[PDB]
Design a protein around this ligand. Structure first.
Ligand SMILES: CN(C)Cc1nccn1-c1ccc(N2CC[C@H](NS(=O)(=O)CCc3ccc(Cl)s3)C2=O)c(F)c1
Ligand SMILES: [Ca+2]
Ligand SMILES: [Mg+2]
Lengths: 52, 234
């Protein structure tokens, strides 16, 4: 397994393979972190998080 | 939900409940955004007029987070038919936006390719609702959730008395007494990935509830992602 097939390419959320390299992205309401892998909620009550 | 567990505080915040004129739940839905609810198209035939309740976990008490919303626009997939149950999907635009808070938050919509290769290949998804707790009983007054394994598509087709189209998938158990049930339809099937829950299905139909050799049948949300996006822009 390589790229997106290897542990989701180290992405928090979406993983795409472009020109043979991993490209991470995030759901609406999240911004891709400076490391280009993590997804940071832009505001309160981001989608898909339990309200704990 | 037959079997499974109660949703505890904050655990199923994307659950919505379609309530009829008598303030009784008849179907579930999934909160997609402040203005939109995802449900099953067949649910639209179970009540003449209905509203959407969010933030409820116990239909017998008032925990202060509950909110009722009127529906402004019903967007039903133009290909749905009771004859095949294919295209069992609809989107509701609410008249007023939902206020997110404890027990009220949207589920994430995933990207299609990634959802098919990474979410639907996970061992399990989670189904939730206020439906019956046994095939012959009454609706649950408490919101429940249940972990349901993804079922191999070939096995799914072999087990079914009706055609499983490409817009459907199977989840649940062969013999274990756990499954969605009456009143759960239209509700969420979500898949967890790194502590984030993505919409993967809509509770659609089953030949009874938790029957041996039968599974629950879900609308494949990944097949409708462009349709949902289009529906949310108008
Ligand atoms: C034969 N056609 C007229 C209808 C049809 N075409 C394809 C599949 N079906 C259906 C088959 C069975 C079916 N039934 C029969 C009764 C059952 N109702 S229910 O409220 O218990 C729903 C139970 C569920 C159990 C698991 C899930 Cl995911 S939903 C149900 O959904 C149903 F609603 C549609
Ligand atoms: Ca309540
Ligand atoms: Mg079964």
């Amino acid at each position: 397994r390589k790229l997106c097939s290897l542990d989701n390419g180290d992405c928090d959320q979406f993983c795409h393979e472009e020109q043979n390299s991993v490209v991470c992205s995030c759901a609406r309401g999240y911004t891709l972190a400076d490391n280009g892998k993590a997804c940071i909620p832009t505001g309160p009550y981001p989608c898909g998080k339990q309200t704990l | 939900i037959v079997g499974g567990q109660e949703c505890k505080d904050g655990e199923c915040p994307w659950q919505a409940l379609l309530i009829n004129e008598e303030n009784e739940g008849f179907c579930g839905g999934t909160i997609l955004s402040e203005f939109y609810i995802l449900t099953a198209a067949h649910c639209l035939y179970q009540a003449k007029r209905f509203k959407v309740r969010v933030g409820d976990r116990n239909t017998e008490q008032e925990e202060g987070g509950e909110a009722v919303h009127e529906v402004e626009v019903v967007i039903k997939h133009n290909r749905f038919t009771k004859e095949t149950y294919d295209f069992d999907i609809a989107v509701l635009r609410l008249k007023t936006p939902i206020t997110f808070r404890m027990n009220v938050a949207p589920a994430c919509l995933p990207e299609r390719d990634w959802a098919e290769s990474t979410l639907m290949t996970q061992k399990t998804g989670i189904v939730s609702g206020f439906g019956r707790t046994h095939e012959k009983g009454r609706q649950s007054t408490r919101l429940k959730m249940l972990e349901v394994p993804y079922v191999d598509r070939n096995s799914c087709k072999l087990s079914s008395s009706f055609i499983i189209t490409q817009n459907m998938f199977c989840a649940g158990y062969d013999t274990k007494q756990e499954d969605a049930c009456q009143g759960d339809s239209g509700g969420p099937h979500v898949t967890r990935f790194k502590d984030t829950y993505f919409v993967t299905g809509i509770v659609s139909w089953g030949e009874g509830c938790a029957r041996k050799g039968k599974y629950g049948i879900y609308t494949k949300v990944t097949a409708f992602l462009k349709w949902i996006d289009r529906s949310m822009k108008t």
